[PDB]
Design a protein around this nucleic acid. Structure first.
Length: 454
RNA sequence: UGACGGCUCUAAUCUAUUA
DNA sequence: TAATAGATTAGAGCCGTCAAT
């Protein structure tokens, strides 16, 4: 019989310094940190798509209710939550006819049709950006449920191509905004959101508010002078080789004041297939870039660098890392994995193990429960029994207690969603996202480096 | 491309041995 | 220059998310 420890739930700081635990309740109670005066929407799509976006924008001005107000809080309305304006008066329609889509979708090759479709969309968007006097804050691409159905490659190539211009954008489908009318031939909706309409409104509003330059919440208590790196490896499929290792990183310092979260990127390439390791030159380049990007914004080098990863580091890349690291900087390499098939069971009956319990195997290895039961919403984050994260300190010296605490803290800032907390640290998740986007088109110089473009 | 969770399925690499 | 094999990694496609069957 072994023992479990408990890690206290982290706090996210809302407006006028009001700590809370749930992002939705903190927003519905206090509001986002900074105020946008309003959101100007540029909608590109068919006429039906324009009508769908219009009626959804008119719908989410009014309050939206979930089936149970405890498991999922109800949505008060966009202006109430965010003290902004995101309404149908600011729509700047750029029509795309259906015949133009048909001229491209009905070819043979999948690469050609996807390329032509992305070309039409991005060319219209770029023409609107360059030579129109409007100031569109976020572009909204309403794609019918006939484009993304047979284009898989649409989204990643889209975002990769629009990178040189830095235009925030957001993709929607009419099934997402008009699930009610997009039933099947049987007469039953395929995407039933009747009991979770408020949750969908929360997610959409949060994503759109962040893509327009608003910061909804931030970490409450994280010590200063410590930086975090999330390194992920992807496969460059369109290269000559079947696989080619691509390292993309997401950096997370706290700030001089608060909530800096950028992503130290510019993909580092390892040509040897299957070897998810960084050559000494690329390792030195990555660490130097991250250190400089911390330094010129803060002023002094970080006192602790926590290089998270889903892979174990070997010796060569590690000594490469310490080659470019200053003496005063503590450097730690943590490995987070979901491989271990451990599954605890609450013997008392219906519900699962409370989220936040750990199992310290030793000094340099522990299990953590990021997914579990949450008393505040009176329901677990998963349906089946949750899986733990095997957090093992691959390299360096660090307190496993503090490592688990920080890994549980970094699971809160998933700005792309409005959920209680993420099941993985957000550095790894966002590094994965921007690495997936940056490898779609292999010709980019100095990518934008800000998450609203990915 | 609303966002996650959980699933299965498909691969490749390293360490070893047996040529 | 081929086989099994533990351990370590990635990529891909899919269903559920209420209450009650």
């Amino acid at each position: 019989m072994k023992e479990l420890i408990y890690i206290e739930e982290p706090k996210i700081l809302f407006a006028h310094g009001q700590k809370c635990t749930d992002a939705r309740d903190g927003l519905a109670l206090f509001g986002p940190l900074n105020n946008l005066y309003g959101i100007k929407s540029g909608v590109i799509g068919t006429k039906q798509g324009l009508k769908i976006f219009r009626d959804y924008l008119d719908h989410i001005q009014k309050p939206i209710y979930n089936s149970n107000s405890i498991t999922r809080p109800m949505f008060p309305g966009f202006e109430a939550v965010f003290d902004c304006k995101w309404e149908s008066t600011g729509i700047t329609f750029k029509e795309v006819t259906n015949e133009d889509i048909g001229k491209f979708l009905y070819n043979s090759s999948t690469h050609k049709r996807t390329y032509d479709l992305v070309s039409l969309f991005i060319d219209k968007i770029i023409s609107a950006n360059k030579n129109e006097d409007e100031n569109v804050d976020v572009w909204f691409v309403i794609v019918p449920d006939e484009i993304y159905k047979y284009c898989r490659q649409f989204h990643d190539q889209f975002k990769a191509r629009l990178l040189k211009h830095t235009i925030p954008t957001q993709i929607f489908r009419e099934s997402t905004l008009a699930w009610r009318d997009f039933k099947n031939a049987f007469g039953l909706p395929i995407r039933d959101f009747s009991k979770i309409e408020g949750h969908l409104a929360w997610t959409i509003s949060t994503a759109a508010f962040y893509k327009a330059g608003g910061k909804p919440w931030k970490l409450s208590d994280v010590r200063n002078g410590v930086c975090y790196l999330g390194l992920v490896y992807k496969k460059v499929e369109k290269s000559k080789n079947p696989r080619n290792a691509c390292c993309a990183a997401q950096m997370f310092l706290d700030n001089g004041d608060g909530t800096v979260f950028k992503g130290e990127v510019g993909p580092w390439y390892n040509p040897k297939n299957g070897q998810y390791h960084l050559e000494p030159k690329e390792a030195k380049a990555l660490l130097s870039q991250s250190l400089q990007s911390y330094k010129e914004q803060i002023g002094e080098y970080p006192k602790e660098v926590f290089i998270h990863a889903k892979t174990r580091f070997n010796h060569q890349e590690w000594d490469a890392f310490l080659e470019v690291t200053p003496k005063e900087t503590n450097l730690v390499g943590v490995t987070i994995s979901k491989t271990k098939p451990l599954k605890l069971y609450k013997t008392e009956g219906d519900y699962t193990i409370l989220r936040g319990n750990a199992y310290v195997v030793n000094e340099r290895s522990a299990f953590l429960w990021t997914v579990g039961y949450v008393p505040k919403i009176q329901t677990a984050l998963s349906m089946e029994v949750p899986n733990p994260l095997f957090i093992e300190i691959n390299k360096g010296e660090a307190d496993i207690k503090q490592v688990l605490k920080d890994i549980l803290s970094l699971t809160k800032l998933n700005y792309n969603a409005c959920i209680f907390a993420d099941g993985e640290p957000v550095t790894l998740r966002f590094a994965d996202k921007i690495g997936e986007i940056l490898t779609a088109s292999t010709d980019i110089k100095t990518p934008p480096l800000a998450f609203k473009y990915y």
